[PDB]
Scaffold this active site. Sequence first.
Site, PDB file in Angstrom:
ATOM      1  N   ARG A  13      47.088  29.555  81.253  1.00  0.00           N
ATOM      2  CA  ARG A  13      47.856  30.351  82.210  1.00  0.00           C
ATOM      3  C   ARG A  13      47.221  30.767  83.541  1.00  0.00           C
ATOM      4  O   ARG A  13      47.898  31.381  84.357  1.00  0.00           O
ATOM      5  CB  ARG A  13      48.521  31.550  81.515  1.00  0.00           C
ATOM      6  CG  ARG A  13      49.323  31.138  80.280  1.00  0.00           C
ATOM      7  CD  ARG A  13      50.156  32.258  79.667  1.00  0.00           C
ATOM      8  NE  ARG A  13      49.560  33.588  79.774  1.00  0.00           N
ATOM      9  CZ  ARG A  13      49.324  34.412  78.755  1.00  0.00           C
ATOM     10  NH1 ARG A  13      49.606  34.069  77.506  1.00  0.00           N
ATOM     11  NH2 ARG A  13      48.849  35.622  78.997  1.00  0.00           N
ATOM     12  N   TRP A  67      47.102  20.184  80.331  1.00  0.00           N
ATOM     13  CA  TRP A  67      46.091  19.185  80.043  1.00  0.00           C
ATOM     14  C   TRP A  67      45.270  19.670  78.874  1.00  0.00           C
ATOM     15  O   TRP A  67      45.013  20.864  78.737  1.00  0.00           O
ATOM     16  CB  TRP A  67      45.214  18.892  81.251  1.00  0.00           C
ATOM     17  CG  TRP A  67      44.562  20.071  81.840  1.00  0.00           C
ATOM     18  CD1 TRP A  67      43.598  20.853  81.269  1.00  0.00           C
ATOM     19  CD2 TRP A  67      44.782  20.593  83.148  1.00  0.00           C
ATOM     20  NE1 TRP A  67      43.199  21.832  82.148  1.00  0.00           N
ATOM     21  CE2 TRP A  67      43.911  21.695  83.312  1.00  0.00           C
ATOM     22  CE3 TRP A  67      45.629  20.235  84.206  1.00  0.00           C
ATOM     23  CZ2 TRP A  67      43.864  22.445  84.493  1.00  0.00           C
ATOM     24  CZ3 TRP A  67      45.582  20.982  85.381  1.00  0.00           C
ATOM     25  CH2 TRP A  67      44.704  22.073  85.512  1.00  0.00           C
ATOM     26  N   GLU A  75      41.681  21.057  70.606  1.00  0.00           N
ATOM     27  CA  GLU A  75      43.005  20.687  70.121  1.00  0.00           C
ATOM     28  C   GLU A  75      42.939  19.359  69.384  1.00  0.00           C
ATOM     29  O   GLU A  75      43.503  19.204  68.300  1.00  0.00           O
ATOM     30  CB  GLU A  75      43.985  20.565  71.280  1.00  0.00           C
ATOM     31  CG  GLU A  75      44.231  21.842  72.018  1.00  0.00           C
ATOM     32  CD  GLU A  75      45.230  21.653  73.125  1.00  0.00           C
ATOM     33  OE1 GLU A  75      46.438  21.713  72.844  1.00  0.00           O
ATOM     34  OE2 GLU A  75      44.809  21.431  74.277  1.00  0.00           O
ATOM     35  N   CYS A  99      49.356  30.572  75.223  1.00  0.00           N
ATOM     36  CA  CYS A  99      48.708  29.583  76.101  1.00  0.00           C
ATOM     37  C   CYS A  99      47.491  30.121  76.853  1.00  0.00           C
ATOM     38  O   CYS A  99      47.570  31.157  77.518  1.00  0.00           O
ATOM     39  CB  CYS A  99      49.713  29.010  77.108  1.00  0.00           C
ATOM     40  SG  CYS A  99      48.980  28.050  78.469  1.00  0.00           S
TER      41      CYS A  99
END
Lengths: 414, 414
Positions: free
Chosen positions: A115, A284, A289, A112
């Site tokens: 973070r 979010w 993506e 991720c």
Amino acid sequence: QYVRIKNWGSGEILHDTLHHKATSDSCLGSIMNPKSLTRGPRDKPTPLEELLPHAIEFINQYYGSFKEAKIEEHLARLEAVTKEIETTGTYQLTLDELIFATKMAWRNAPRCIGRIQWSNLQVFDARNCSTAQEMFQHICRHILYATNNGNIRSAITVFPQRSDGKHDFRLWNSQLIRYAGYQMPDGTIRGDAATLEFTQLCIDLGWKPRYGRFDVLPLVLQADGQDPEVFEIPPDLVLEVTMEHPKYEWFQELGLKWYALPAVANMLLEVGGLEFPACPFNGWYMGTEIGVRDFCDTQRYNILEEVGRRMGLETHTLASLWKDRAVTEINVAVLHSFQKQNVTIMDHHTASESFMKHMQNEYRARGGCPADWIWLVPPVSGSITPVFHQEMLNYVLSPFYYYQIEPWKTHIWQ
Amino acid sequence: QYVRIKNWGSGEILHDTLHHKATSDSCLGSIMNPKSLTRGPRDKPTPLEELLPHAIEFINQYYGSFKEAKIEEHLARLEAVTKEIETTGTYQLTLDELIFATKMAWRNAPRCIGRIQWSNLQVFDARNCSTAQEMFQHICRHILYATNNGNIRSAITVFPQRSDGKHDFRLWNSQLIRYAGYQMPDGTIRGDAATLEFTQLCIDLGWKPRYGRFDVLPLVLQADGQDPEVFEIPPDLVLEVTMEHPKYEWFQELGLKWYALPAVANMLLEVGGLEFPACPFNGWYMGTEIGVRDFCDTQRYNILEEVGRRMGLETHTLASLWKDRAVTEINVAVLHSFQKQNVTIMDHHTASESFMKHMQNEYRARGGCPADWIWLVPPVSGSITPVFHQEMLNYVLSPFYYYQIEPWKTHIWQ
Ligand code: HEM
Ligand code: HEM
Ligand SMILES: C[C@H](O)[C@H](O)[C@H]1CNc2nc(N)[nH]c(=O)c2N1
Ligand SMILES: C[C@H](O)[C@H](O)[C@H]1CNc2nc(N)[nH]c(=O)c2N1
Ligand SMILES: N/C(S)=N/CCC[C@H](N)C(=O)O
Ligand SMILES: N/C(S)=N/CCC[C@H](N)C(=O)O
């Protein structure tokens, strides 16, 4: 005997034999779902001798946190938990402990980039839950809270922990909101091809197939051990963004849109020996993506072909770098559309710069930061990003968000 | 004690302590120069007991190759080598053996995408060489042959193997042709900042600093054990491509160009126990290397800033995806310019598609294919590429092209 390698594009599987002739010096790094990142089923509780040290370790982590520790309570809690452990078997976490758990587990998720927001997380205690219907309610409360009408908020709703291993709460979906995919009559495929097998499942459980390109799938929930109860998501809850390019007015003619909420559902939270096989969370979206992965993957909506055609590029000449041009425009469309309709989103560049800042804080603070380069580097413009030029170690700490075997493979049918 | 992590962008070094708190399940994959991929100096020859099995293994590999093996010669060669080994210590490879060695070593290089061309390689036997001047000549013969006036040809020139470990032939340069970098008076930096330390070295060895942005560096060669003799490359030999965009006529105003020959110099070829610390090779450029890495890296020519400005983009707004747009155009400029001036080159897309075809041939054939995803995936448009969606194992086989400690750190000064 040999290693299985899959191509997530063509779905083709290969068996590597050569690795055996390796040197006396085999990185699994490329693999998507390794066993080392998964935490499967059970049949018996967590053996005390293991559960205990993990628990103590965890409590030590927690109390070692706050400026000027509460030594008395530290000892007390250790003692109290130790006791509770030998008395019940498992044990319960103080709310504040869970908060700390989830934040650290996120803080420990090597795949991720968001973070740097680890400390800004909302936790929904659904540990006292007991029914699918009750899950559904917590989930909606989640989706509603998360969405916040565009100004997306990071949150996680923690359902009941693992007891014996046959009384697990599990969300069968990939993520909270996710479009459906149907293999149509004319041989084609409409919607999200990724959710093809799962869709059929919903169908088998008597779900009403709306046969479109953007049909938000139903929540397949299972409580305690009981079978999955199908629950359809309230459309008022599902916020979406209709895609439209800032200069190519023909882009909206594509009739494209996407959900505003990225909420991973099927993951497992491991902490102090305990494990919660159900605890969906959300952050979010990061442009790429949707623009790169979701819209352009061969296995997804695969739009690159026509976004290129409508742009007029030499679609039959790879060397023209049309694919590079098209994608970039789809990316701005997404960013523009989210920006326009006031839905939180972050471009991949600003994202990476912040992650770089995250590590700087992370290393200086605790002395490390588990990072999966393969995952952290944006699907486009890799080297343009700071993280590409950043060496990183990918290691599993605790607490942690593990993957888990798809529940429909390992489930009882009463 | 701890692990050192460097950021190849800012050059900043970090020490990871956290990894120790890892789980009972630490991929080094992200690291650029691991010890596991390097083959350093020596002081003594290769102990017989090791040299022998490696040798036999190698000979078995070679003879196990050809359709209808030459069993008699196989045994004979085994025997002959065994003998030669116990008699001299080291041993010499039949020319055809070397050919096979280099091709396999390339075939085993996990960080190269051009490996579908593994069978189309030219080998220059410089094993009987003995002087720096003589090296220089072989190198020029190489550069000339490789260049082939634009129609680039893959080739490798193999210098003398390792004897004791203090009589090593070594090219101090990164690659055959490579521009210089000078830290100018006005605080700036002209040329290729990557070759900054090395440039100073050439300067120290009395090299004439031409103080420009594209000054092809001199060949720093060292034979047997003797110190490095500086040799300047004949400009007639150095073919270059002047950059010019197919639509932005102002692009050539940037006064940009780049060498047409990608020839890695400082690598070591390990085979059947023996090791050749000097054997530069070359393939042909893949657009992104120049367009993305060379021209856009912060640590290189770093042109993104102005290519963006001159294009008119919102250079002060990351979210505008200008960086994505700029790079793509620089990429076409490079491809266009190489294509225009008839210099071999391959766009990253066609490159990846062929590599995918390579694996298919590789797995079906020998049962594997060592691949470093981190390296194989293009620096831009990652997921647009097939290799992004391809799981792969990164393992070291033999023969192999290892990295090696920069010679100026470990060298005698007589
Ligand atoms: C606040 C904004 C956030 C951003 C920008 C962000 C972004 C991302 C991105 C870009 C990925 C890769 C997604 C993919 O390719 O499938 C990812 C993965 C992940 N994120 Fe974050 N995230 C955010 C918040 C969170 C939160 C709140 C949690 C947990 C509490 C979290 C947990 C994870 C995990 C476990 C993964 C790995 C998913 C997998 O392995 O499939 N993220 N996130
Ligand atoms: C025929 C065309 C070839 C192409 C398109 C090609 C392309 C590439 C590319 C794109 C890289 C990454 C370069 C970088 O980022 O620094 C690379 C690395 C490499 N190539 Fe290939 N290559 C070719 C031929 C060869 C040949 C002929 C050999 C050896 C005989 C070879 C050996 C290697 C090795 C060892 C590396 C790794 C370099 C390193 O670790 O720094 N390549 N090549
Ligand atoms: C096979 C390969 O690991 C896989 O396609 C990857 C690579 N990196 C990724 N990184 C992110 N963020 N998301 C992904 O799905 C993937 N997939
Ligand atoms: C730190 C990281 O490994 C490094 O920046 C990488 C990644 N992948 C790469 N891949 C290629 N082809 N060339 C490179 O130099 C790099 N550098
Ligand atoms: N930003 C976050 S939390 N992403 C998680 C999964 C979203 C998925 N990559 C998708 O594109 O749907
Ligand atoms: N295509 C090949 S053989 N590349 C090897 C090194 C070239 C380097 N990446 C550069 O850009 O100079």
